[PDB]
Structures are given as structure tokens and as C-alpha cells.
Amino acid sequence: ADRGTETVPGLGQRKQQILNSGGGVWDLAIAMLETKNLGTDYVYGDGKTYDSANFGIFKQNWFMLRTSTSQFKGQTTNQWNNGAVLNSNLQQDIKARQESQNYYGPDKWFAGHRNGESGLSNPYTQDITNYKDAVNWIHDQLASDPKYLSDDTRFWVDV
Numbered sequence: 001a002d003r004g005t006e007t008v009p010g011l012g013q014r015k016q017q018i019l020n021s022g023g024g025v026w027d028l029a030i031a032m033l034e035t036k037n038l039g040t041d042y043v044y045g046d047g048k049t050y051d052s053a054n055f056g057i058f059k060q061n062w063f064m065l066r067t068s069t070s071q072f073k074g075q076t077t078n079q080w081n082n083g084a085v086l087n088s089n090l091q092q093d094i095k096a097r098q099e100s101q102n103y104y105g106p107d108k109w110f111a112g113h114r115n116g117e118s119g120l121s122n123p124y125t126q127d128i129t130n131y132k133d134a135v136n137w138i139h140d141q142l143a144s145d146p147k148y149l150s151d152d153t154r155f156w157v158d159v
């Protein structure tokens with residue numbers, strides 16, 4: 001198969017932190033696919049620079065953060081290192097992402113999250129649609145039983 005489960009020790013305490021710091025099950029599912037341990041200790045920017053750089057547990061790219069969040073509204077591609085603050089502020093991480101989705105709408109947020117500025121022109125490419133449904137599958141799992149909100153079960157889908 002191309003999706004399943006895996007045990008990650010401590011994951012349950014990270015899930016509760018996200019749900020107690022302004023997150024909902026929807027944010028948990030997005031963050032669950034981005035990283036294995038719901039954290040921010042991947043390589044800085046996820047290896048990318050300028051508008052492509054990724055920050056926070058959801059790996060929001062800088063283009064999205066500076067066009068659609070109040071924390072970064074109006075900043076330029078050159079200030080892209082400023083997004084790094086989300087790596088250590090979970091509440092702002094979660095809040096930036098919720099604000100971003102509500103500025104663009106769920107489907108264009110998806111397109112922007114996955115492809116950056118160039119996705120905004122067609123939110124329904126197969127690539128972006130494969131991101132949506134994966135996240136939607138994971139949400140269904142976490143919402144099928146509340147034990148999954150505090151155990152170490154990671155529901156994963158292959159990209």
C-alpha cells in the first residue's frame with residue numbers, strides 16, 4: 001500500500017500540545033504528513049531559500065507566509081529568514097497557517113502550500129489534488145477514534 005500507521009514515541013504528547021495551543025484535528029493531519037514527529041528539526045528551510053523556504057510544523061513556504069499572514073504581511077522575499085521564528089513558537093505556527101488558509105480559501109491555500117505562487121493559477125492539478133486527499137485520508141483516521149489524538153499512532157501517506 002501507499003499509506004499506513006507507525007508508532008512514534010512521544011507523538012501523543014505533541015498531538016495534545018497542538019490541540020491545546022490553538023490547533024484542530026485538521027491542523028494535526030496536515031502536520032502529521034509534513035514530518036514524522038510533529039516537530040521542526042528538519043533541515044533549516046527544508047533546504048530551500050527565498051519564497052520556497054519552509055518553516056514550522058506544517059512547512060509553510062515563505063511566499064505564503066508573507067502574502068497571507070499578519071505576522072509577516074508585506075515582507076519581501078529577501079526577509080525570508082524571518083519565518084524561522086515559527087520553528088520555536090508553536091502558537092504562531094498554528095495561527096499563521098489558519099490565517100493563511102482563511103485568506104486564500106482551502107483550495108487555493110492547498111495550491112499555494114504545495115506549489116507556491118505558481119499553484120495559485122490552477123488549484124486542481126493532480127499533484128495538488130493528491131496532497132488534499134492524503135491529508136483528508138489522515139484526518140479521517142484521527143477522527144475515527146479519539147484515542148488517536150493522544151497515542152503515538154502516526155497515520156502516513158506516501159507524499
Ligand SMILES: OC[C@H]1O[C@@H](O[C@H]2[C@H](O)[C@H](O)[C@H](O[C@H]3[C@H](O)[C@H](O)[C@H](O[C@H]4[C@H](O)[C@H](O)[C@H](O[C@H]5[C@H](O)[C@H](O)[C@H](O)O[C@@H]5CO)O[C@@H]4CO)O[C@@H]3CO)O[C@@H]2CO)[C@@H](O)[C@@H](O)[C@@H]1O
Binds near residue numbers: 051053059115
Ligand atoms: O517547488 C514547489 C513548492 O514546494 C513547496 O514545498 C513543500 C515541500 O517541498 C514538501 O512537499 C513538503 O511536504 C513533504 C515533506 O517535506 C516530507 O517530505 C513528507 O514526507 C513524509 C512522507 O510523505 C511519508 O508520509 C513518509 O512516510 C513513511 C513512513 O515514515 C515509513 O518510513 C515507511 O516505512 O515509509 C513511508 C513512506 O515513505 O513520512 C515522511 C515524513 O518523514 O511529505 C510531505 C508531503 O509531500 O511540503 C512543503 C510545503 O507544502 C515549497 O517549497 C514552495 O516554496 C515551492 O514553490
